[PDB]
Design a protein around this ligand. Structure first.
Ligand SMILES: CCCCCCCCCCCCCCCCCC(=O)OC[C@H](COP(=O)(O)OC[C@H](N)C(=O)O)OC(=O)CCCCCCCCCCCCCCCCC
Ligand SMILES: O=P(O)(O)O[C@@H]1[C@H](O)[C@H](O)[C@@H](OP(=O)(O)O)[C@H](OP(=O)(O)O)[C@H]1O
Lengths: 271, 68, 68
């Protein structure tokens, strides 16, 4: 929390910063947002001023979650196609390079596969929140009607106390109060349960995806460790590379580890 | 006359639930509609009692006054 | 291809029952339609078994012959 504990907008030194200086900021960060034109802004603004006042914020949150989920699909597609392009480019080189590049592309290819399942779970969580939005939006009109009846009673009492509509209006008010007494309870009963369930599901999905990505990256580093390099003098010929079998075993082990992993067998143990 | 609309709304909600259940059982509007129906039933349970409480008293008083 | 129409008819009968129950529960056609539905279910229970019995045998025999 650099922003919270200091007025500075920079990054405070840490263990990672002390071990390795932070890299310079990315140069391809333009001033213009370019957030997919005005479609995002329209989807963001139109949803917050149409329906009932009680459920106005959750609709905006649902729309923003939809935009968040939409972006990751494009990211995953671009990464997969980048892996394909790297594999295509690696062909017209030396034997060892034409194999290590292909294996790295194959390994990189699974990030999009993981992201697809992550997106599906994200959509499930978004639907779970939409349910709460819907129920609260349906709940609001009862309290609206009760307030209207109370205001009508208050005005008609001031206008003239001799009107015969006092008794019927009072009975309607007590009926509306009796209805709202259970309406509020049934509204408050399910929010703390559905929110908890949705957030638990989201956190479990995040943990699983992160652990799978970390395992894939570790095995990719293990495979890349095999790529031998040494300076070559002009006129010399490098020895014939014979490492085809080891890479196959490495990727087979990667597949076995990815398939065998379960949620209960999580490697990361938070303190 | 003021009492009647509550039962009207309850009947409308029941009909809507019955139609939407037939149309497709996978809709997420079943739970909210059922909660609204139970709320309307709880309201009508006291509405009917408060309607029936005063009729037998006011009619008797008016007719006694008229006969006197 | 010959097996499919039985399940088609069962689905049609189920849909008809579901619609007619929603339209009005006082119709006298509920009992006859329910009996027809249970009859169709009893038929399909053996239809599915007789469909699934022979596929795994004929496919295996044909592929063994082709490989030989
Ligand atoms: C600077 C600038 O104006 O970038 C405008 C952006 C980016 O185009 P580019 O990086 O200059 O061109 C890349 C490639 N070499 C080319 O010449 O084409 O090109 C554009 O005009 C924006 C098009 C969509 C990119 C949205 C990101 C906006 C961030 C700024
Ligand atoms: O100043 P501009 O007009 O915005 O163009 C940038 C820069 O001047 C170079 O043309 C290019 O680097 P290279 O010549 O090395 O390709 C860079 O591409 P990049 O952002 O992908 O590095 C562009 O973003």
């Amino acid at each position: 929390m650099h922003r919270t504990y200091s007025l500075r907008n920079s990054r405070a030194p840490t263990a990672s910063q002390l071990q390795n200086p932070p890299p310079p900021p990315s140069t391809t960060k333009g001033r213009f947002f370019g957030k997919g034109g005005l479609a995002y802004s329209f989807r963001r603004s139109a949803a917050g001023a149409f329906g009932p006042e009680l459920s106005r914020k959750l609709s905006q949150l649902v729309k923003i979650e939809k935009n968040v989920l939409r972006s990751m699909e494009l990211t995953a597609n671009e990464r997969r196609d980048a892996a394909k392009q790297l594999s295509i480019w690696g062909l017209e080189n030396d034997d060892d390079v034409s194999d290590i590049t292909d294996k790295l592309g194959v390994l990189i290819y699974e990030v999009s596969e993981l992201d697809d399942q992550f997106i599906d779970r994200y959509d499930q969580y978004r639907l779970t929140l939409k349910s709460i939005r819907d129920i609260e939006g349906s709940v609001q009109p009862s309290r609206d009607r009760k307030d209207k009846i109370t205001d009508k009673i208050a005005y008609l009492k001031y206008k003239d106390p001799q009107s015969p509509k006092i008794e019927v209006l009072e009975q309607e008010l007590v009926r509306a109060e009796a209805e709202s007494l259970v309406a509020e309870a049934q509204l408050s009963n399910i929010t703390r349960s559905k929110l908890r369930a949705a957030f638990n599901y989201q956190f479990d999905s995040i943990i699983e995806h992160s652990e799978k990505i970390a395992l894939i990256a570790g095995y990719g580093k293990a495979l890349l460790e095999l790529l031998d390099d040494s300076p070559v003098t002009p006129g010399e010929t490098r020895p014939a590379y014979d490492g085809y079998e080891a890479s196959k075993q490495i990727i087979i082990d990667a597949e076995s580890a990815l398939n065998e992993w379960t949620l209960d067998s999580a490697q990361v143990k938070p303190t």
